[PDB]
Design an enzyme around this catalytic site. Structure first.
Site, PDB file in Angstrom:
ATOM      1  N   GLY A  10       0.797  -1.211   0.000  1.00 45.40           N
ATOM      2  CA  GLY A  10       0.000   0.000   0.000  1.00 45.40           C
ATOM      3  C   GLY A  10       0.832   1.265   0.000  1.00 45.40           C
ATOM      4  O   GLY A  10       1.984   1.261   0.447  1.00 45.40           O
ATOM      5  N   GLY A  12       0.585   5.826   0.471  1.00 46.00           N
ATOM      6  CA  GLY A  12      -0.193   6.900   1.058  1.00 46.00           C
ATOM      7  C   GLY A  12       0.710   7.949   1.677  1.00 46.00           C
ATOM      8  O   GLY A  12       1.873   8.090   1.295  1.00 46.00           O
ATOM      9  N   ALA A  13       0.147   8.685   2.639  1.00 47.99           N
ATOM     10  CA  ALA A  13       0.908   9.732   3.312  1.00 47.99           C
ATOM     11  C   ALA A  13       2.067   9.157   4.112  1.00 47.99           C
ATOM     12  O   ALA A  13       3.101   9.819   4.268  1.00 47.99           O
ATOM     13  CB  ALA A  13      -0.011  10.550   4.220  1.00 47.99           C
ATOM     14  N   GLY A  15       3.950   6.798   3.166  1.00 48.96           N
ATOM     15  CA  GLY A  15       4.989   6.371   2.250  1.00 48.96           C
ATOM     16  C   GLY A  15       4.513   5.273   1.322  1.00 48.96           C
ATOM     17  O   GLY A  15       3.358   5.281   0.887  1.00 48.96           O
ATOM     18  N   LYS A  16       5.388   4.319   1.013  1.00 50.34           N
ATOM     19  CA  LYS A  16       5.048   3.194   0.151  1.00 50.34           C
ATOM     20  C   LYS A  16       5.595   1.922   0.780  1.00 50.34           C
ATOM     21  O   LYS A  16       6.811   1.784   0.949  1.00 50.34           O
ATOM     22  CB  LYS A  16       5.608   3.390  -1.260  1.00 50.34           C
ATOM     23  CG  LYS A  16       4.865   2.614  -2.334  1.00 50.34           C
ATOM     24  CD  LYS A  16       4.693   3.454  -3.590  1.00 50.34           C
ATOM     25  CE  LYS A  16       3.814   2.753  -4.612  1.00 50.34           C
ATOM     26  NZ  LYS A  16       3.490   3.641  -5.763  1.00 50.34           N
ATOM     27  N   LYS A  33       9.424   0.005   3.896  1.00 48.13           N
ATOM     28  CA  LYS A  33       8.766   1.302   3.800  1.00 48.13           C
ATOM     29  C   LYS A  33       9.798   2.335   3.367  1.00 48.13           C
ATOM     30  O   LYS A  33      10.704   2.675   4.135  1.00 48.13           O
ATOM     31  CB  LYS A  33       8.114   1.698   5.125  1.00 48.13           C
ATOM     32  CG  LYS A  33       7.542   3.108   5.121  1.00 48.13           C
ATOM     33  CD  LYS A  33       6.255   3.207   5.925  1.00 48.13           C
ATOM     34  CE  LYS A  33       6.489   2.970   7.406  1.00 48.13           C
ATOM     35  NZ  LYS A  33       5.229   3.126   8.186  1.00 48.13           N
ATOM     36  N   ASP A 126      -3.272   8.457  14.333  1.00 51.88           N
ATOM     37  CA  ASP A 126      -4.065   7.991  13.200  1.00 51.88           C
ATOM     38  C   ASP A 126      -4.376   6.504  13.365  1.00 51.88           C
ATOM     39  O   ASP A 126      -4.135   5.688  12.474  1.00 51.88           O
ATOM     40  CB  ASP A 126      -3.343   8.274  11.882  1.00 51.88           C
ATOM     41  CG  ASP A 126      -4.266   8.191  10.673  1.00 51.88           C
ATOM     42  OD1 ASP A 126      -5.502   8.151  10.856  1.00 51.88           O
ATOM     43  OD2 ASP A 126      -3.750   8.167   9.532  1.00 51.88           O
TER      44      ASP A 126
HETATM   45  C1  LIG Z   1      -8.091  -5.385  -0.256  1.00 55.01           C
HETATM   46  C2  LIG Z   1      -6.628  -5.091  -0.599  1.00 55.01           C
HETATM   47  N1  LIG Z   1      -5.989  -4.360   0.507  1.00 55.01           N
HETATM   48  C3  LIG Z   1      -4.517  -4.431   0.398  1.00 55.01           C
HETATM   49  C4  LIG Z   1      -4.441  -4.986   1.816  1.00 55.01           C
HETATM   50  C5  LIG Z   1      -5.949  -5.186   1.731  1.00 55.01           C
HETATM   51  C6  LIG Z   1      -3.514  -6.139   2.186  1.00 55.01           C
HETATM   52  N2  LIG Z   1      -3.568  -5.559   3.550  1.00 55.01           N
HETATM   53  C7  LIG Z   1      -2.326  -5.673   4.194  1.00 55.01           C
HETATM   54  C8  LIG Z   1      -1.936  -4.787   5.200  1.00 55.01           C
HETATM   55  C9  LIG Z   1      -0.695  -4.957   5.799  1.00 55.01           C
HETATM   56  C10 LIG Z   1       0.126  -6.002   5.380  1.00 55.01           C
HETATM   57  N3  LIG Z   1       1.392  -6.249   5.929  1.00 55.01           N
HETATM   58  C11 LIG Z   1       2.207  -5.380   6.654  1.00 55.01           C
HETATM   59  N4  LIG Z   1       3.155  -5.947   7.380  1.00 55.01           N
HETATM   60  C12 LIG Z   1       3.986  -5.222   8.102  1.00 55.01           C
HETATM   61  C13 LIG Z   1       3.874  -3.844   8.099  1.00 55.01           C
HETATM   62  F1  LIG Z   1       4.741  -3.133   8.852  1.00 55.01           F
HETATM   63  C14 LIG Z   1       2.862  -3.245   7.322  1.00 55.01           C
HETATM   64  C15 LIG Z   1       2.697  -1.754   7.285  1.00 55.01           C
HETATM   65  C16 LIG Z   1       3.606  -0.834   7.853  1.00 55.01           C
HETATM   66  N5  LIG Z   1       3.175   0.377   7.648  1.00 55.01           N
HETATM   67  N6  LIG Z   1       1.974   0.306   6.941  1.00 55.01           N
HETATM   68  C17 LIG Z   1       1.689  -1.002   6.717  1.00 55.01           C
HETATM   69  C18 LIG Z   1       0.468  -1.525   5.982  1.00 55.01           C
HETATM   70  C19 LIG Z   1       0.530  -1.196   4.485  1.00 55.01           C
HETATM   71  C20 LIG Z   1      -0.821  -0.968   6.601  1.00 55.01           C
HETATM   72  C21 LIG Z   1      -1.044   0.488   6.199  1.00 55.01           C
HETATM   73  C22 LIG Z   1      -0.221   1.407   7.099  1.00 55.01           C
HETATM   74  C23 LIG Z   1       1.199   1.485   6.531  1.00 55.01           C
HETATM   75  N7  LIG Z   1       2.065  -4.061   6.619  1.00 55.01           N
HETATM   76  N8  LIG Z   1      -0.286  -6.820   4.423  1.00 55.01           N
HETATM   77  C24 LIG Z   1      -1.459  -6.692   3.833  1.00 55.01           C
HETATM   78  C25 LIG Z   1      -3.787  -4.215   2.964  1.00 55.01           C
END
Ligand SMILES: CCN1CC2(C1)CN(c1ccc(Nc3ncc(F)c(-c4cnn5c4[C@H](C)CCCC5)n3)nc1)C2
Length: 269
Positions: A10, A12-13, A15-16, A33, A126
């Site tokens: 994902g 957004g604000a 990052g990526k 990230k 948030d």
């Molecule tokens: C319907 C389709 N949508 C795509 C999604 C459902 C798959 N579903 C997801 C979330 C997190 C992770 N795995 C993960 N594992 C470790 C992490 F540290 C992070 C992480 C760290 N920061 N952020 C994240 C995520 C992207 C959550 C948003 C905040 C930013 N994410 N897998 C899958 C999002």
């Protein structure tokens, strides 16, 4: 290179975030990230926020996501990989919803990781089910914090632009607490004034002494009249869960229960 991206989780604000392969640790899944930093030269506020994140990693709290590595170039953070977030868990859970004792456990792990952050003066600002990760074994891990749009989980003082202390996260916990039983957002507004309007339709109009001064929106701007019983929107909740839910959904952030006091609530007996 030490890592190999395989998919995008994902953007957004924040990052990526990428799903990557840890080539030097047996090929395990990790989360990269990348965040760009305007060098001149790097801002001191960004350097200081990273040191707090690595200091918080030294405790290795089980309810926060692990920080494996930090790389520079513009700034790559290597976190442990979690398979899903809270929304994916609530969308896939069979009927008639999440088990009652599973909600108690997930809310307890949420408050533990949040109290760990508030004990070190770190505000998530948030909190939402999109950044609450659910481990394959059922563990709750917080993510996307410490580094500087859905308003459904914003505290009333954030919508009013007054205070931004730690009670901001406890309000979001209450909104997530209700979404555990509902499997749908409690306060689903479309704007700042709309979100605050749907909040006061449930919890009722607070006292005039509870409204913050020198804010744009006055108390007279809303005619929400009285409050409503919380079991109309949150069915199947018990007495102890209702009392804890209302203490999180308190308008005045000074009267709002803390994450430390929420851990000792009779709801977790
Ligand atoms: C319907 C389709 N949508 C795509 C999604 C459902 C798959 N579903 C997801 C979330 C997190 C992770 N795995 C993960 N594992 C470790 C992490 F540290 C992070 C992480 C760290 N920061 N952020 C994240 C995520 C992207 C959550 C948003 C905040 C930013 N994410 N897998 C899958 C999002």
């Amino acid at each position: 290179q030490q890592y190999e991206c395989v998919a995008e989780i994902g953007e957004g604000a924040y990052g990526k975030v990428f799903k990557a392969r840890d080539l030097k640790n047996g090929g395990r899944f990790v989360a990269l990230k990348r965040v760009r930093v305007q060098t001149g030269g790097m801002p001191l506020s960004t350097i200081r926020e990273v040191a707090v994140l690595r200091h918080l990693e030294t405790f290795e709290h089980p309810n926060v996501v692990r920080l494996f590595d930090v790389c520079t170039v513009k700034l790559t953070l290597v976190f442990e990989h979690v398979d899903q977030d809270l929304t994916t868990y609530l969308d896939k859970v069979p009927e008639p919803g999440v088990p009652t004792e599973t909600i108690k456990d997930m809310m307890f792990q949420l408050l533990r990781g949040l109290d760990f952050l508030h004990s070190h003066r770190v505000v998530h600002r948030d909190l939402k089910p999109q950044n609450i990760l659910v481990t394959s074994s059922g563990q709750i891990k917080l993510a996307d914090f410490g580094l500087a749009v859905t308003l459904w989980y914003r505290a009333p003082e954030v919508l009013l632009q007054s205070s931004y202390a730690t009670p901001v996260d406890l309000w979001s916990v209450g909104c997530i607490f209700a979404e555990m039983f509902r499997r749908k957002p409690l306060f689903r507004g479309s704007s700042d004034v709309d979100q605050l309007g749907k909040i006061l339709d449930v919890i009722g109009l607070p006292g005039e002494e509870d409204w913050p001064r020198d804010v744009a929106l006055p108390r007279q701007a809303f005619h929400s009249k009285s409050a409503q019983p919380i079991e109309k929107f949150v069915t199947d909740i018990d007495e102890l869960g209702k009392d804890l839910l209302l203490k999180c959904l308190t308008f005045n952030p000074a009267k709002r229960i803390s994450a430390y006091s929420a851990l000792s609530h009779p709801y977790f007996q």
